[PDB]
Structure 1
Amino acid sequence: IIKKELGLEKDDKDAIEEKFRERLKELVVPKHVMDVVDEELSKLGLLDNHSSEFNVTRNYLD
């Protein structure tokens, strides 16, 4: 909570979700891949950061 009052979090307005969405925003991309990316992002949001599943999902998305 002190971090919320003043902390590293909530700075640079950077999120993995948004970062990956903007990375592909400049790419002429098909749709099937688009739905796969949507599913991967949904799982990543569902998946907790500390989980190894989360790291595997992040690597695959990268």
Structure 2
Amino acid sequence: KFRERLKELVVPKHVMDVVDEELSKLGLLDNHSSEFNVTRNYLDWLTSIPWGKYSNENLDLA
């Protein structure tokens, strides 16, 4: 479910190789627990940050 939030966003490898590991850790931990909550937050706000989104700068001085 977290992967779809970065499907349309370019993600660097050095964090993508941690996203899947943390997702596996979430999938092996028991539901609704302290460690589960921490891993849920960590996955959520890895997949929420805009790795591949760049705002267009204004090139015109006018």
Taking structure 2 as the reference length, what is the TM-score of the superposition?
Answer: 0.66
Q: Segments of 4+ in structure 1 off by > 4 A?
A: none
- Alpha-carbon deviations, 1:2-61, whole Å to 9, x = none? xxxxxxxxxxxxxxxxx2110011111111111100110010000111221000100111
CA RMSD of aligned residues (A): 0.8
5+ long unaligned stretches in structure 1 = 1-18
Find the counterpart in structure 1 of residue 58 from structure 2: none
Q: How much identity, in percent, do the aligned residues show?
A: 100
**Unmatched 5+ stretches in structure 2:** 45-62
Kindly indicate which of the two structures has a greater share of residues assigned to helix.
Answer: 1
Structure with greater contact order relative to length (CA < 8 Å, sep ≥ 6): 2
Between the two proteins, the alignment pairs up a number of residues equal to 44
Tell me the equivalent position of 2:35.
Answer: 53
